[PDB]
Amino acid sequence: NVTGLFKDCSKVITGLHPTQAPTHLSVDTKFKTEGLCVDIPGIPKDMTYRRLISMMGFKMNYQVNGYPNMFITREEAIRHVRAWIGFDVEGCHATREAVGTNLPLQLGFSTGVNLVAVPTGYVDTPNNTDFSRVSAKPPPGDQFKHLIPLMYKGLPWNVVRIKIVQMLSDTLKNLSDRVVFVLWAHGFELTSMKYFVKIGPERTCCLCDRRATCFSTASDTYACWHHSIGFDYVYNPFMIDVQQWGFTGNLQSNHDLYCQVHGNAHVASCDAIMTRCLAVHECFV
């Protein structure tokens, strides 16, 4: 059995040298024997490769003392309804030097905000993982024709995550000590979270007694929603997947049963609005 998490998306026909392969699975077949690997003097390492590694397949089901759970129960989400921010991501497909993974393109929130990012992936090299721009194409289809211009209107992720932190801080400072992302088929949104979320034990703000909701890589400091100006990471967020509450059809068809005021403009923010709206109607009626 294998997973899609960290799937190698390169087009290289050979596997990795035993010293460079992160796992036994990714070692080239020439070096495998008796359930182990052998070193073959004369078959050297590759010092120029660039292999795109897929961030699709994350599973946040860890049980670690002092580390809060990201995915919360429906009853705990209800208690924190003031912290609800609907979230959806429209992605693009890896192309040319890689194939097999989706990258964040349009990040939509129930606040009405849409942020366009430069298609960026996690590329393994002989020295490290290089978080960098990758070739990408919008999904093949006609309901995604609005994504074609967005391939050239994106911002670097170092800017995008500052904008996310700023938007959430402005929205939640007077509402909650938290953020609860309200999702529908959470998979790709969780993948997208890898680009702007950090987790760990609960911390306090550096300027006050409130719990920390933000993190800064530049200063290694934590801040609440009131003092997070310039912060780049969302720290210890919470989330829930509305699709998992037993609904049979797609987002729009379930949303439309209770609500007729949120039309499908087919943009990421519109799906995020519909997700939070459906969660409100299902939870409180």
Ligand X SMILES: c1nnc2n1CCCC2
Cβ atoms within 10 A of the Cβ of 212, count?
Answer: 23
DSSP-assigned beta bridge partners for residue 181: 85, 239
Of the candidate spans 53-61, 147-155, 156-164, 259-267, the one that interacts with Zn ion by CB under 5 A turns out to be 259-267
Name which position in 133, 173, 210, 266 contacts Zn ion (CB under 5 A): 210
Q: Binding of ligand X at residue 171 (CB under 6 A)?
A: yes
**Cα torsion 211, 168, 240, 182: sign:** positive
**Contact partners, residue 258, CB within 8 Å, separation at least 6:** 277, 278, 281, 282, 285
Q: Binding of Mg ion at residue 271 (CB under 5 A)?
A: yes
Q: Binding of ligand X at residue 179 (CB under 6 A)?
A: no
Provide the annotated active-site residues: 88, 90, 189, 266, 271
Spatial strand order in the sheet of 214-216:
221-223, 214-216, 233-235
Q: Binding of Mg ion at residue 88 (CB under 5 A)?
A: yes
**Min CB(111)–ligand X separation in Å:** 5
Name which position in 42, 48, 59, 142 contacts another protein (CB under 8 A): 59
Backbone Cα Rg of the chain: 21
Helices 251-258 and 268-284, axial angle in degrees (round to 10): 50
Q: Which residues of this protein are in contact with Mg ion, per CB under 5 A?
A: 88, 271
Q: Which residues of this protein are in contact with another protein, per CB under 8 A?
A: 1-10, 15-27, 33-34, 36-39, 41, 45, 53-55, 57-67, 99-101, 122, 124, 126-129, 193-194, 197-200, 215, 233, 235
